[PDB]
């Protein structure tokens, strides 16, 4: 259960550049550091992660990572593992305005594009190249939102009813009557994404006007089949690529409201804790076979706590691979949000400070 | 002013509710006719926790008796305290459930559930601040079981910040009273584990053992067992009513006991017991009370807590007692029995004291433990489940009512998952590979 | 003039307030109802001392305190008890469910909706005062109402009221004896708020008082009342300087000046020398030297620490009763020569002396015996670091496996905040080890 954690910093936006803002993030090698504007004289906080990505300006001859570099680091290997008949999971995290949309999607200039467009383009190009008389391929897409431990369909324009989760004894957890649509190239894996994003639940709080309120899961089911020169033709190769947009954590102080606005956040925080523990187990499990060969006991990772793990069971365990990317805001104003994101990233394969 | 609502589904739940209400009415000094005749004003200091006022200065209890067999309602209404409950809360149907979970969850319960939800919503709106719910049912059922689980799910969906308790009776290992018991038990436990914060474990065999060996009774009946369960429930709910040197709210118990959200099954107990003739020789002190508290025979779940390594424990005390005895005794019990406790909690015992003792006793104690040994119950049921599922012993009577096969396998998988989570914190060290 | 407006938060605060106000009312002759026959008998005086009470036209006397809590069962006992006519009806009890030992609930899910009214009532009380030399906040670590509400109230008060002193009397969980399984979480969370706002916070441990009551007083089976009585006597000894005449009086600012060497080490201990029962009251001279020597006895300390394993930064003594300065100087000289009580190199004076002519009063019933002398010893000790370390270890044993985190997380607290508070505690420990090292 390979785990990779990457922390990226976005450049200044229009609002930050309009004011006389300052940068409070420094990064070198494989280490990140922040300084508190409130009390500059105490000490700089430091953390270590598996990947660090500085992105402020173009030339930046020391420690600059274009989108191609991070794609080659994470997405290319993830897709390569996907093709050989295995499950794949990619997580995005970051507070509102941290720039997770910049990381995953990017701009449409065809020179700086995110992980999703690059991955989809490489997938469709490889499928188009390899499709000979024997091989054949199929791809299916679905999109859903998890919200107060209830699952809703974003693609279907039907009534926003709560679907029922089931456990097929062979195929594992799944959702009943979840909309599924066929796709053929990149143009489609988007219009679907835009339509699903338009339907997501969202409200306004004291922190931001358009702060999200629910987790989103984007499932790509990839099926292969090989037509041999005989009657015995079987697929035997079904892969799942999961892309999870995780809503940000929040304090009850920042969410200065009572009632539903509190409740959602509380439940959100619960998921944002338990998933951490699960991945905190996998990484440790991953270290077992790797170095000390600890196999004794399934060490059954707790898996049913909430719904978000109990639906991604097949994708996050077994022999799958997991990447997680956390966006940071370099503005001095958002010190607490950045510190919270960095501390959350510090979990899930903690690494000492070198 | 904290306030808790009570529901009782099935024959066992209704009988336990009647005995519980007769016990609480005696403790608070309520007459059968509904009038008040007490000895001190302190009883009425917090009467709102279970009762409601009336125009004639009467006190009407808060209960919703639900059942599908009119015979139990007729028996209860003609009992010693039959008239105490207001008539409108007696909601019921006919044709029974027939000891079938499918009839009591999908076919017949769908009609009475609407009326029960209307009544419980009306009751909940009337309280000043709802704290939680209580539900009583026997798992090996089909009337109480299915409707109880349905009400649990509906109430959890509607009110999601109120500690929903449940005092339930599960199948015994050897003393079997019905043939389709494991199916109902497994389905109901699957529907129960995800929709409750604190559920207690009562076994008929344990109550019979307590009645025989300890109380030295000759011919026990259902009344004695209902008494024990009522005593335990009152004790559990004690701290909300009367003051004390240190109190234990229900949410305090919920926050302190359960370590992780899943693991919420509790093993209860009550002390002391003199067996009607040893009271003259037995000395009532805190060390003797706690010594009988942790003894295995007192326990009401039929799971010996010697293979368990207690995860957590709470002890609600009732009486005027110096706390030094309580604290030193708890520390001594921890240190002397270190092998029967977990190491990654530094100290794992909570205490609470109420100054007002029970009428007719100088001091009493109520035990609410949480130990891994409860797996020995669940696993047993699981074994019997497969023993009747491999060949489909009586599976057709459930598919007749529109229940698919997948729902049984899902419940069994959840059962095995619960057993395995219990089991991880059961070996007395890791240091392994 | 010389007011000491006090706040009680939590059940520990309420019980300690009961004991404290019983002691004060018995000291000043205030009847439980509020009337004062003593001044009327005298025919003009100042027995309605402003340090703890306020006087109205009709001869009644109202105390200056609040009893904020979330459990009505704790305050209704006082509301309908023997003292029902003394307090103002604004005892400010919340009619809502308890916080259930959860720091987050006591901070920003149910601790809110009350804090505005509490601050308003505190403002109304303080408006009547031309003094207001210091706040007294009693609480107990353990979460729920106490720690969370104390943290919020201190955070608001430090902003609103500026530089006025704020003494805290905090009950601390014992190493071996505990009454909650989420106590270490709550204490490690509450340090992050008590460190940066409380100017000088004391500490008292239950197990220490249990041992002291077992040994000295021959009380085999003590209860909460005796512990509250001892804490009441300690606070009375501290605050006696502001009310009665004395040869060498010490104000609250003197405590805040002498006992704190640096801002981050303002965590002293306390004790009480003549804690002697009636039967043993005789057969002992109880000279000034003997009680002063008994103050530093390790077995009588009010928190389970070993002062032999540390060094004394500063010490302040407050004597009550017939104690002349010559004997005090002789006792100080005799104490300073022993090498068991090691002193730091950078504080060669290391003592503050104080005398009050009012002898201690005896609460009826109770346990203490009448003594014509007494002394309250406060000292800053490095050994208190040990008292943290054990608690810290408990936290480090429980936070790793993620136990009881779901309840806290589901009430508005982010997971990361824990670590921040933990780091701060470590910093405090390091600071103590930085100060006790000998100079080059
Ligand atoms: C005469 C006398 O005092 O003897 C005791 C007695 O011997 C013991 C054994 C009693 C007795 O209980 C039993 O024999 C018993 C039978 C079946 C199941 C459980 C118990 C007693 O029957 C039960 C009875 O309890 C009460 O009266 C309480 O109020 C009890 N309520 C009732 O059950 C009740 C009894 C009579 C009339 C109305 C109600 C209660 C206690 C706590 C909380 C709620 C309710 C008491 C004191 C005794 C007898 C009579 C022997 C005990 O019961 C309780 C809960 O008090 C059993 O464990 C206690 C310990 C007592 O020492
Ligand atoms: N010394 C002393 N300690 C007390 C007293 N009352 C309560 N405590 C302490 O309070 C702790 C319980 O936690 P608290 O937060 O104070 O309880 P509470 O004030 O009722 O608030 P909740 O915990 O939310 O119920 C115990 O560990 C006790 O040590 C008292 O009267 N005297
Ligand atoms: N503890 C207890 N259990 C009971 C009592 N009466 C019946 N039971 C249990 O209840 C189970 C029967 O379930 P039941 O409620 O009758 O189902 P129903 O007939 O469909 O309502 C049996 O396994 C009995 O052991 C009682 O008085 N006390
Ligand atoms: Mg409380």
Residue numbers in the entry:
A (entry chain K): 4 to 357
B (entry chain B): 1 to 433
C (entry chain A): 1 to 440
From the study:
KIF1A, a key member of the kinesin-3 family, is recognized for its high processivity and fast MT plus-end-directed motility. These attributes are crucial for the long-distance transport of cargoes in neurons. Mutations in the microtubule-associated motor protein KIF1A lead to severe neurological conditions known as KIF1A-associated neurological disorders (KAND).
To advance structure-based drug development, we determined high-resolution structures of KIF1A harboring the KAND-associated P305L mutation in complex with MTs, using the same nucleotide conditions as those for MT-bound WT KIF1A. In the ADP and Apo states, it shows a one-head-bound open conformation. Weak densities corresponding to α- and/or β-tubulin tails connecting to the motor domain were detected in all nucleotide states, suggesting that the P305L mutation does not prevent interactions between the K-loop and the α and β-tubulin tails. The integrity of the 310-helix remains intact, with most changes occurring towards the N-terminal side of the mutation. A notable divergence in the P305L mutant is the reorientation of F303 due to clash with the introduced leucine residue. The P305L mutation alters the structure of the KIF1A MT interface, hindering the transition to the strongly bound configuration (from step 1 to step 2).
